[PDB]
Structure formats: structure tokens, C-alpha cells
Design a protein around this nucleic acid. Structure first.
Lengths: 388, 388, 50
RNA sequence: UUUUUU
RNA sequence: UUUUUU
RNA sequence: UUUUUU
């Protein structure tokens, strides 16, 4: 095969090319230490290296009541092993301040200056679970950007307060605090992976915070992977007999992009349970799935998908995909109407049964058009009010 | 075979014809030493021999937390072994200045004068990972030249800042600093190979810097090898039944170039995972793949490729390939339209299904023509504004 | 059967009469004249009447 | 010598 | 680079 | 996020 050159170095075998070691602390006052860490985050000081260790300890306090010996035996730590990430257990007896967990060295010595200056509140009421839930609120639409993150987080805050599930501290719902939390969970990988694992693997026994985390993980599936959903659901549509190709995707240049996309999906399927979270977790073969590598396939698939529903009309695209998207959308509208008349005729139904279903279909289309127009106006208003 | 003479000395067996030994240092203050090295680079002093050692230590600080004992066991060092490149571990106890890592000898004695004169900043905030990411930003379009390097780097700087991923020091985003970094990573081989290996082999667990490096390595595939992509995707197009030859490539003189090109691709395939990076890494058989050895094949392939998309119209060629490229492009346009009418007719579709797809195809072609004209105007404007 | 055939050519946005015209010497000459006319934006005359 | 978009 | 609704 | 009656 002389054409395999184009696929060289894409779906490479699993290999460990790093060594990362994280210190976990066996202590007695795990709750107090976690409260101190939460206060440290609230202040907004950057955690150079101890961010990973502090957030992992915050996670093991919520998942395993605070002892890391049980965490190293968990499936999460087993998965992190094999990618070069290991955890260290280190006993401490008297932890009167947060700083004696820090080591010695240039960065630790620099950060000790700042952590020594804070006035920690001796009595505080905030568990690790509350912080973990608030952080999980950011996971859907995290790859979109700051605006969408904060917007969705507020929306979810009302959704969870009305549900009578949790109340968050008022200082947590300010723009500044949300901004620092966005920094923190955008940069860090271990926190996001631990949230994903806990959310999508706890089969029962959810607390309030566990319920919130599970919901947020469910809402995060295929975030940043809209191309996969659109292509698989509409372009490479599967039927009872086989994989039917859509009529709008039979252009010659689309076919090559479709072949390469099949290969890229084949690579993405390697991460079994975490494939829906590839863009969030920055897994290996996720840069191979981009608009820009498959310009017209992406535009056509999004247009075909937009033709069906009414909320996909609010998805923005770059300057160079709008017109092809609209053309595909209108073509799919006309094709869908034609197929619906033919399928209505082929069905075994009466005269009155015709007319009931036909009036219903007309009303359905009308509702769909009206809702799509409303969504388009909403998107235009949002965009044009952003830029003022 | 009397014709094998023309292929003598092209795909030669693997053999080691060099011996290169690099000293790696086992120390305690790896972070401080790396900060000193970064400051040395920031000043702009040339590193005669210690460039390789300093950058390799900078890489092992980011990949393995700073101990070279783990790096010598890595697959990267195993690959470098077998090409005559070895690493030396050398313990040091008290490293109070950068200069005591240097040895004794004419070049070291000369460079000690300069490194003794710098005023190193005792406290600095810049990891090895940040420098490695900034250097990886240069890898795509590195073989093009200084202009494209700096242009793409700035574009990526906005892309990564808007994504909320990293912030770089302001002095790093000046033309002078980018210029010295271009010198440094253009000359050095070990740094580029280490960046490539880390980017394309880390399957999961990416940090922010690891994510940036992986993205930049993904964008670097087949950089400087546009001829391979064009020929393999269009000229030697492969089908369900075999490798179809394009109609425009059946001229007699193109056939011999195509045979030689098949041999050259056969040689290039020897480097399995690093074939996409052959021109960047200056691998063995990459001078055998040039425009100039295959003049008309290159021109025809680029023209056929340009006919399909709209961004390939911005690729420049030499004085002696423009007209053949344009002729091939126009011929491919007409052939593509003919094939599209025939393929539309052969498909099993209705009357209305005709007209929907035919209007869609017309709109698609119109959009394509408009975008190609815009890109051509952009290229003309860029070139004619460069030369003023 | 007498050598006269018709071509179907799709156009999306026809804001003026001139963009139906092609490119060429005669079309380029006639575009000058059709560009100078002041077409009446609202008119009441069908093709059937003509 | 490379020249586009990602 | 991502862009919707959930 | 759920929305009725039992």
C-alpha cells in the first residue's frame, strides 16, 4: 500500500513518554486542610505545582473520606498509571497551617511567601464536594470560552437552586470568582479527569454533589465534537441494511474527506469510555477532527443537521462555511419534504388517515419554521449585542 | 536489470556514520538551572556546543521532572541511539551559577567570558514547558522562512490566548526575540525531534503546554511536503478496484517522473512515524522529493489539487511552473464539471431530486469560484505589498 | 432537430438585469447601455400582455 | 530550498 | 481552537 | 431538572 503514507503517525500504539509524580498526604485533619485549600482558591493565588496535589487531595476527601490509601487502589489511579502519572503517600502528624504540606525548593519557597500572608478563617463551612460540584458546573461548554462558561454556569445555578438541591456561597457567584475557577479547571487535567470518572462511573448512591457532578458530566458528552455528532447522525446515516450515504455528500471531493474522517473516528474510538470527552481532556487524536481539515464536509453536515431541528440554527461557523451551510440546509429542507410525501403515500392508511397525518405534518413543519426563525433572531441579537 | 543503475545509492541500508555524545546533568536545582538557560536564550547569546545539552536538559525537566536517569530509558533516547547520538549523565552538587556546568576547552573557555557578564535574575517565573511550547509554535511553516514563521506564530498566539490556555511574556512577542528563537530551533535537530516525539506520542494526560505542543505537531504534518500530498491525493488517486491514474498525467514524460516519484515515496516510507516530518527533520531521502526533479508532474499535480479546493490557490510556485499549473487547473475544472453531470445522471434519483441536487451543485460551484477569487486577490495583495 | 437547444443556468441573487448577461465582446458592449437605463422598481405589465 | 488553509 | 439545545 | 391523576 503506497497510500498508507498519509496515515503514518496518526493511530500510534500506546506508549508512556512522561513521568509525573504527585504527593498525596495522609493526615488527620483532612476536612480542615481541604477548607484551607478552598480558601486559597477563593483568594485567587496561583498554585504553580501544588495545584495538582491540592485538587487531588480535595477529590480524595470527597470520594474516599480523606485517606489516599484507598485512592491508589481505585480504577481512576489505575487509569492514570499507564499514562505516566503516579501518586505519593506522605504522612504528616501536626498540620497547623497549610504551608507545611509544601516542600522545599525554588517554586515552593516562592509560593510560601504568598501563602504565609493570607488570613485563613479558622472556622469555615464549605466541603470539598461543594467546590467539586461548582467546578463541574463549568465542564459543559468549557471548550467554547469564558462567556459561554459563565453563562451556562449561571443558568445551571438557577436550575439547581429551583430544584432544591444546593445553595452556593454568594461570593462564588461573582464574575471574578468564576473567572479564577475557569483558569484553574481549564489549565488542570487531573481535576477534569477525576470529575469525569466520578460522574460517569458512580452507578448509584449519589449525594447532592454527586448528583450535580453526574448531571454535568452527562451534559458534557461530545462537547467540542459537534462535527462527530452531525456527520454520524446525518451524513453517514446507518440503516437496517447498511450505512447509507447522504445524497448531498456524493460530490467527489467530499468523498476523500469522508474517508479521512472515517479513519479519524477509528482513531478516536480507541479511548473507549472517554471518547465523548476527547476535546475536553485533549486526548491524542482530537486535533485530527477539526473544521478546517474537512471544510465542505463540516459545512454540509451542519447544514443537513440544521434542516432537521430548530436549535442547531444557533450554532456559529467561521466566515468561510456560512453559505455552503445555508445551501445544504435549504436543499435538505426540500428533499425532506419530498421524502415525506413519498413516505406518507407508501404507508398503508385510509383517506381520513391521510388527511389527519397530512394536516399534522403541515402543522409540524409550520411550528418548526417558526421556532427556527425565533432562534435565528435570538442568535443575531446575541451576536450584535455582544459587539456594542 | 540494467536500469537499476539510476537507483544506486538512493535507498541505502541503515548505518551509523557518526558519534555524538551529549552531557546531561544530575542536579538538585533543576528548575533554577532551566530558568538560567531560558534567561540565556532571552539575552540572545549564541550557544556553540552547549546548545544541544542545554535544550535537552530543558526538555527532560519538562518531561521527566528533571532527572536524566529516566530520560536515558525513554523511547526517544532509544531512537537517537542507532543514529549515533548518546547522552552522558554527570552529577553536580553545588551549582551556584550557570557556568560551572560548562567544561574546559577552547570553545567553553570562550563562551564562559560571555556567560560570566550576564546579570541573571535571581527570581524568575518561567518554566521549561512555556519555552518548549513557544518553540513548538514555530514548527509549522518553519521550512518556509522567517516571515511565515513569525506570522503563523502570532496567529497562533491569538488562537491560544482567546482559548484561555496560556499567556506569554511580552518580551517574547517582539520581532527580535522571535528572531533569535527562529535561529535556535532552526539550527538544532535534537530539540525539534524531542518536540515531535513528545507531541505525537503522548496519548493522554496533556498539560496546557503539552496540549499546545501536540497541536503544533499536528499542524506540522507534511510541512514542506506539499508535493507528496497533492500527488498522492489527486494524481495517483486510489479507488475501490486499484490505483487509477489521472487523465492529465498520461503524457509520456510525466510517466517516467511518476515512476521515479513512486521510488522516492518508497524510500521516504522507511521512516515510519516521522515520514510526515521528513523535511522538518531533514531525514535521509527528502532531497529526492523536490520540485525541479519533477517539474511538470509537480505543476500538474498542484493545478489539479487547486481545481478542487479554494485555499490551495494561495500557494506560490517558481517562475517556470505557473502556466502549466494554470492550464492543468482549468482543464481539471472542465473535467470535474463533466464528471459531475455524468455522476448526477447515473445516480438513482427523482425529478425533484435532480433539481434539488443540481441547484445545490450550482451554488456550490459559485461559492467555490468566489472564494478562490478572494484568495487569489489576497495572495496578489500580500506579494505586491511585501515588495514595497 | 433543427439545431436549436436551450441551456438551464441557475442564478441566486438577480438585483439588476445585467448579471444575467455573460462575458464577451458583445455582452461587454451591451452592458454599458443596460447599465445606464433607469429601471422602474415597481411596474405593472406581465409577460402575457407583451 | 520551501511557499495555502488548518 | 471551539461555537446550539439539553 | 421536573411538571397530571392515583
Amino acid at each position: 500500500e503506497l497510500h498508507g503514507i498519509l496515515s503514518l503517525g496518526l493511530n500510534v500504539d500506546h506508549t508512556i513518554v512522561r513521568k509525573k509524580s504527585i504527593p498525596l498526604f495522609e493526615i488527620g485533619n483532612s476536612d480542615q486542610v481541604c477548607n484551607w485549600i478552598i480558601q486559597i482558591i477563593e483568594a485567587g493565588v496561583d498554585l504553580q505545582e501544588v495545584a495538582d496535589s491540592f485538587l487531588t487531595m480535595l477529590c480524595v476527601n470527597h470520594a474516599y473520606q480523606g485517606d489516599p490509601n484507598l485512592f491508589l487502589e481505585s480504577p481512576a489511579a489505575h487509569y492514570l498509571k499507564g499514562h505516566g502519572i503516579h501518586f505519593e503517600i506522605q504522612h504528616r502528624d501536626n498540620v497547623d497551617h497549610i504551608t507545611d504540606l509544601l516542600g522545599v525548593g525554588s517554586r515552593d519557597k516562592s509560593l510560601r511567601k504568598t501563602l504565609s500572608a493570607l488570613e485563613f478563617e479558622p472556622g469555615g463551612t464549605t466541603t470539598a464536594g461543594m467546590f467539586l460540584s461548582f467546578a463541574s458546573l463549568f465542564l459543559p461548554k468549557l471548550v467554547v470560552g469564558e462567556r459561554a462558561c459563565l453563562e451556562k454556569v449561571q443558568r445551571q445555578i438557577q436550575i439547581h437552586a429551583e430544584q432544591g438541591l444546593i445553595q452556593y456561597p454568594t461570593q462564588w457567584q461573582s464574575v471574578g470568582h468564576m473567572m479564577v475557577v475557569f483558569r484553574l479547571i481549564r489549565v488542570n487535567f487531573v481535576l477534569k479527569f477525576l470529575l469525569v470518572h466520578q460522574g460517569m462511573h458512580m452507578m448509584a448512591g449519589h449525594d447532592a454533589n454527586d448528583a450535580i457532578i453526574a448531571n454535568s458530566i452527562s451534559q458534557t458528552r461530545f462537547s467540542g465534537l459537534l462535527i462527530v455528532k452531525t456527520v454520524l447522525e446525518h451524513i453517514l446515516q446507518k440503516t437496517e441494511a447498511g450505512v447509507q450515504l447522504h445524497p448531498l455528500a456524493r460530490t467527489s471531493k467530499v468523498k476523500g474527506e469522508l474517508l479521512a474522517f472515517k479513519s479519524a473516528l477509528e482513531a478516536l474510538a480507541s479511548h473507549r469510555e472517554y471518547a465523548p470527552f476527547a476535546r475536553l481532556l485533549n486526548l491524542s487524536g482530537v486535533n485530527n477532527l477539526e473544521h478546517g481539515l474537512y471544510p465542505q464536509l463540516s459545512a454540509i453536515a451542519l447544514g443537513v443537521a440544521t434542516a432537521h431541528g430548530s436549535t442547531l440554527a444557533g450554532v456559529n461557523v467561521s466566515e468561510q462555511y456560512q453559505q455552503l451551510r445555508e445551501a445544504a440546509t435549504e436543499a435538505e429542507k426540500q428533499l425532506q419534504q419530498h421524502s415525506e410525501m413519498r413516505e406518507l403515500e407508501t404507508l398503508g392508511l385510509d383517506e381520513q388517515e391521510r388527511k389527519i397525518l397530512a394536516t399534522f405534518h403541515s402543522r409540524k413543519n409550520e411550528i418548526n419554521i417558526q421556532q427556527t426563525s425565533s432562534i435565528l433572531a435570538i442568535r443575531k441579537e446575541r451576536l450584535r449585542k455582544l459587539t456594542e
